[PDB]
Design a protein around this ligand. Structure first.
Ligand SMILES: Nc1nccc(-c2c(-c3ccc(F)cc3)ncn2C2CCNCC2)n1
Length: 351
């Protein structure tokens, strides 16, 4: 029973993976865990194998590990990261302590593309279209990415995009400080935690991304939280009475009102020489009031993606049960919960 494993010390990290994976070669490591590039002899794909660090060292980590396995096991879309395999050398639940995850190796992200300069309108419709397609699928399952930025969109030679590095796990702490790109794409309402966020925060991120693809420049590259909010409000206008009442923090409201009111700028004078349809879409995505922002499913129907929009080919996801988020379990219960999901994984078909 079970495949044969083989262990090899890699840059001070013992990797014990099934032999179907060959030519393992370090490609990065961090707070997520260690990632290795390898050749998967069964699917014929070059893959990325992630060996989580201390997967069950705490209940926060035990839950994190579980939340990511559950999410990766659900995501089944072309434009979204997916699980090709999950395994543990552990013979029994008693010795289960390591979790390795496998997905298609991604080479370049959107970043190793835009930086060059501004992009062609066609490639902008395509890339953004794909982002919105994955998103309509992600949100239809009540999932919020929370961290949509260029570095989190894997892009290939034929401009095919996949959304990865979801939030559902890590908690941004002290990483959003200063002149950092980790924050240039967050909606203002989640950036200063004015209110509890909705999935439209993701739609705000896409507008930021789309704007950058068009101009070739970061839309709101603020040097700190306040400076960035200033950049946003200068373009979108200051909150109105309708919005102000939706902000719980009395301090936030008090701060906001201390600012000299400003009208929404003319997007056609910001994105000079850009397709009127692109401009029209940004105006709909970049709305201060998250309640009035366009939805992924609606964006797709927008005349900007006429060339690619196919209603019958923009699938939604199966219902996604994240009731466990409310569950209070001990380290060992998230651990056993993680084990069953590993144990029960079913590979996606082939070609
Ligand atoms: N090189 C590469 N290619 C594909 C994915 C990743 C990956 C995974 C990951 C996820 C699921 C899985 F099953 C296996 C690995 N977790 C983080 N990253 C990187 C994503 C880009 N920035 C640094 C970390 N890295």
């Amino acid at each position: 029973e079970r495949p044969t494993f083989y262990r090899q010390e890699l840059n001070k990290t013992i990797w014990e993976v099934p032999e179907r994976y060959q030519n393992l070669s370090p490609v990065g490591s961090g707070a997520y865990g260690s990632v290795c590039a390898a050749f998967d002899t069964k699917t014929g794909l070059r893959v990325a194998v992630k060996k989580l660090s201390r997967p069950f060292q705490s209940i926060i980590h035990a839950k994190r590990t579980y939340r990511e396995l559950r999410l990766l096991k659900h995501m089944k879309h072309e434009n979204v990261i997916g699980l090709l395999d999950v395994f543990t050398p552990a013979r029994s639940l008693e010795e289960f302590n390591d979790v390795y995850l496998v997905t298609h190796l991604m080479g370049a992200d959107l970043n190793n593309i835009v930086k060059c300069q501004k992009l062609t309108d066609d490639h902008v419709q395509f890339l953004i279209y794909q982002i919105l397609r994955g998103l309509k699928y992600i949100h239809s399952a009540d999932i919020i990415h929370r961290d949509l930025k260029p570095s989190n969109l894997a892009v290939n030679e034929d401009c095919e995009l996949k959304i990865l590095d979801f939030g559902l796990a890590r908690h941004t702490d002290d990483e959003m400080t200063g002149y950092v790109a980790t924050r240039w794409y967050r909606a203002p309402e989640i950036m200063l935690n004015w209110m509890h966020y909705n999935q439209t925060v993701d739609i705000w991120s896409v507008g930021c991304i789309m704007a950058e693809l068009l101009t070739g420049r970061t839309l709101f590259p603020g040097t700190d939280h306040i400076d960035q909010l200033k950049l946003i409000l200068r373009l979108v206008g200051t909150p109105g009475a309708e919005l102000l009442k939706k902000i719980s923090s009395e301090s936030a409201r008090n701060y906001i009102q201390s600012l000299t009111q400003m009208p929404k700028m003319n997007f056609a004078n910001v994105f000079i020489g850009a397709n009127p349809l692109a401009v029209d879409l940004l105006e709909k995505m970049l709305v201060l009031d998250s309640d009035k922002r366009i939805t992924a499913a609606q964006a797709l129907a927008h005349a900007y993606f006429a060339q690619y929009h196919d209603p019958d080919d923009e699938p939604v996801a199966d219902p996604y049960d994240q009731s466990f988020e409310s569950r209070d379990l001990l380290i060992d219960e998230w651990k056993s919960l993680t084990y069953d999901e590993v144990i029960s994984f079913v590979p996606p078909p082939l070609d």
